Amino acid sequence: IQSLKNKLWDESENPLIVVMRKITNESSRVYSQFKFSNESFTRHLREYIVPEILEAYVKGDVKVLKKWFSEAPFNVYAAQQKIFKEQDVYADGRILDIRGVEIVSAKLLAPQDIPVLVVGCRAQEINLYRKKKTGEIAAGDEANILMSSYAMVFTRDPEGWKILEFVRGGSRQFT
Amino acid sequence: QSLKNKLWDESENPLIVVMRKITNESSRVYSQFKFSNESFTRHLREYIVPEILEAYVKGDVKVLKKWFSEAPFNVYAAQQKIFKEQDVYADGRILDIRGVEIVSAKLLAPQDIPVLVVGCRAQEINLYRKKKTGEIAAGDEANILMSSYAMVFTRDPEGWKILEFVRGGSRQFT
Ligand SMILES: [Cl-]
Ligand SMILES: [Cl-]
């Protein structure tokens, strides 16, 4: 049934189609726009950009993410920080391994015609928070290893790129 | 268009994986077991699911021989053989069992069999030990894994059987 695919589409919490919903709700003119090569900048994402953004996103680093993140996604990140400020607790987490770092989609959207690159990856990390003064764990485990999933909407300037939309999720992969 | 079919084709969500093979009305399936829907859903979370998953992680085959039919037990026995080929045994433990619900009821295409699809999520630790001095081979004792289960039910007049079974892969961290 077509209804089952439709239900699965707008009900799944995989970062990639979460992102895909808010771009839509062909790829030929996208790759010619930037000129650089897809394959040459795929490993350049995996080399520097992705690890540098992830460890920043995990530790709670705002000054670096303010650069990469656009006006709206950074706002929704800073708003997530309020609660941690309110609970008087700080982010103490790190990223162990980042495997799965490739460019899936390439599309342009409704407001004007901004070209966009969609980057998906899986990461391995622990997520814990310590009390601002006692340095004691408030929430989160080290013993527990977390398998996260990511979807980044990239754009270019006509340091380097900008994140148009970002989402942390959970990978079904055990490693 | 492209994007909606591609997901349905390439998703490893146990639920739609099971549902992808089936697709090759509910009211005709339910009143055929007479029994009721909600009395089965609570009987799953309190008898069947705990009883079947208990055996799955521990490897207990004398239980899964009763519930599993020939095709998915073939899939399970073959997986288990490789554990033995490594002198390893399944010392797993399911800690929590939360997500328990019959998501769909369908009649298969080959013949008119009444089928009920049960969606599931569970907290568990995966661990393996050697034969002599059963200690460690695989997994971590203090690492909680979230697993997504899916299963297809029917009965032959401890009552039910399982024709299809797939496991593993929750997006939930807890
Ligand atoms: Cl995944
Ligand atoms: Cl999914």
Swiss-Prot record, chain A:
Compartmental location: Mitochondrion inner membrane
Similarity section: Belongs to the Tim44 family.
Subunit composition and interactions: Component of the PAM complex, at least composed of SSC1 (mtHsp70), MGE1, TIM44, PAM16/TIM16, PAM17 and PAM18/TIM14. Forms part of the receptor complex that consists of at least 3 different proteins (TIM17, TIM23, TIM44).
Protein's job: Essential component of the PAM complex, a complex required for the translocation of transit peptide-containing proteins from the inner membrane into the mitochondrial matrix in an ATP-dependent manner. Recruits mitochondrial HSP70 and its co-chaperone (MGE1) to drive protein translocation into the matrix using ATP as an energy source.
Protein's UniProt name: Mitochondrial import inner membrane translocase subunit TIM44
Organism placement in taxonomy: Eukaryota, Fungi, Dikarya, Ascomycota, Saccharomycotina
Gene responsible for this protein: TIM44
